[PDB]
A paper describes a structure:
The heterotrimeric RNA-dependent RNA polymerase (RdRp) of influenza virus is composed of subunits PA, PB1 and PB2. It is responsible for replication and transcription of the segmented, single-stranded viral RNA genome (vRNA) in the nucleus of infected cells. Transcription of viral mRNAs occurs through a unique “cap-snatching” mechanism. We initially screened metal-chelating compounds by CEN enzymatic assays, followed by a cellular phenotypic screen and then optimized the chemical structure to improve the pharmacokinetics and safety. This culminated in the generation of the compounds BXA and BXM that target the CEN in the PA proteins of influenza A and B viruses.
All four PA-BXA co-crystal structures exhibit clear and unambiguous electron density for the compound, which is bound in essentially the identical fashion in each structure. When this residue is mutated to the more polar threonine, the structure is essentially unchanged in both the FluA and FluB structures except for the side-chain of the residue. The side-chain of T38 is orientated such that its methyl-group is in exactly the same position as the CG1 of Ile38, whereas the OH group is orientated towards helix α3 allowing it to make two hydrogen bonds to the main-chain carbonyl oxygens of Met34 and Leu35. Thus, substitution of Ile38 by Thr38 reduces slightly the van der Waals interaction with the compound since threonine lacks the CD1 methyl group of isoleucine. Furthermore, unlike I38, which does not change conformation upon BXA binding, T38 (and M34 in the case of FluB) have to change rotamer to accommodate the inhibitor binding. These two effects (less favourable van der Waals packing and induced fit change of threonine rotamer) plausibly account for the reduced affinity of the inhibitor for the I38T variant and hence the lower susceptibility of viruses bearing this mutation. The reduction of susceptibility to BXM for the I38T mutant is less for FluB compared to FluA. Since the direct effect of the substitution, as observed in the crystal structures, is essentially the same in FluA and FluB this suggests that the contribution of I38 to the affinity of the compound is proportionally less in FluB than in FluA.
Author numbering: -1 to 62, 73 to 191
The structure:
């Protein structure tokens, strides 16, 4: 099985289209770069999972009514920048200098999501070298490890559902001799 075929079988059409659109903005070609398309699909999928299972009520109380998180990843950078900058103004906070992956309506922070094949901690601190504390960080590995800058933001159950998806994907890729494509 080829990577492109795996992608089309394991990811929703919306995610695939967005990740390709994004690679195009950077003029990376999805057909020449199937590992990048895979990685971008996973990252965007994780973002969507996080936003899909956190809601808030009229007062501001959590629940596993309105979405807790706005996904900024997956839009064209020009729109994404207008959206980041406008959310930040409308909540009276600093606009980060990097483009974020999510906005948390509860804590009023921008979130950077990271996916890694190494250890979650190594990728946490690397991200923090650039971002300082402009954003919260949510780092997931394919080795069942995580590294949140705020443990409450995401529930212990939810971290585990993202970790299991990743574990699912690594398993199938390995079964199909495609994991080596990513390493
Ligand atoms: O927003 C991201 C980004 C992240 O948010 C991230 O967590 C990791 C990596 N990123 N990068 C993603 C990306 C995202 C997920 C997995 C791998 C890659 S690999 C580089 C690349 C990305 C997107 C399109 C493209 F053509 C690329 F070459 C670029 C880094 O420059 C800001 C935009 N961006
Ligand atoms: Cl950026
Ligand atoms: Cl940089
Ligand atoms: Mn991003
Ligand atoms: Mn990210």
């Amino acid at each position: 099985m080829a990577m492109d075929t795996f992608i089309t079988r394991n990811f929703q059409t919306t995610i695939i289209q967005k990740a390709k659109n994004t690679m195009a903005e950077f003029s990376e070609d999805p057909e020449l770069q199937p590992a990048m398309l895979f990685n971008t699909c996973v990252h965007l999928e994780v973002c969507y999972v996080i936003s899909d299972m956190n809601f808030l009520d009229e007062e501001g109380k959590s629940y596993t009514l309105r979405p807790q998180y706005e996904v900024i990843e997956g839009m064209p950078r020009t729109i994404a920048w207008m959206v980041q900058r406008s959310l930040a103004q409308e909540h009276g906070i600093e606009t980060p200098k990097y483009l974020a992956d999510l906005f948390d309506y509860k804590t009023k922070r921008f979130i950077e999501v990271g996916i890694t094949k190494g250890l979650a901690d190594d990728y946490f601190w690397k991200k923090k070298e650039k971002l300082g504390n402009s954003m919260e960080l949510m780092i997931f590995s394919y080795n069942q490890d995580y590294s949140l800058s705020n443990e409450s933001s995401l529930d212990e159950e939810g971290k585990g559902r993202v970790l299991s998806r990743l574990t699912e994907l690594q398993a199938e890729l390995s079964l199909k001799n495609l994991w080596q494509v990513l390493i």
